[PDB]
Amino acid sequence: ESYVETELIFALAKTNRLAELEEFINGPNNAHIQQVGDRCYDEKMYDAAKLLYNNVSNFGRLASTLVHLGEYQAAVDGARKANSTRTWKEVCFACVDGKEFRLAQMCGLHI
């Protein structure tokens, strides 16, 4: 049953049982990421939806969830392919209105 898979992996996130969950993904999950792949970062139980959006290749969403996750190096590493201006312009105007010049001018490669 797909639903029991979805809720199971969501609970594995709930009980933060990471490695086992991820190696399970090597099994034919047929589950619903972007539903539970959403539910994780929705619960903000971060560092978990990361692996999900990776192994199911959830570009833009994986990058945004990386940013929200506290991940920023790998976030830009994926966004350079994604090129979604979202976090770019976020940091950009945050520093511009703040009259700053480091983070905005660093991430400004996507303008």
Partner: protein, 130 residues
Amino acid sequence: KEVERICRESNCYDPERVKNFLKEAKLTDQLPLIIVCDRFDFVHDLVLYLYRNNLQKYIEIYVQKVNPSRLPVVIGGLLDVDCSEDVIKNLILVVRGQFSTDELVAEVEKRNRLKLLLPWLEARIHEGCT
């Protein structure tokens, strides 16, 4: 000859549990899915998954001969599933059925990369129109 026969014909299933079945019906020559899945439009996810396992021409030939009409939308799916370009280019270059450059430009502008379509560019700008 029998099975996807009714998949074209009959439409009284749950085509979603059905399509679910398809997904789970590992039978290695599926093209009723190319019919009913898009009959109820699970097609981004569909083709997504497809190439994910793999996809070569099957939706392509479906939208080729079965139905050129869904070209633009599947085109959008293609670039949302983030894939290559020369195939649909040739598709436009090869005889196309029903299609407007005015939706192609909008979709690819959403995609931001209109770069090549010189055949259909000729089609558009030679109407009094890039």
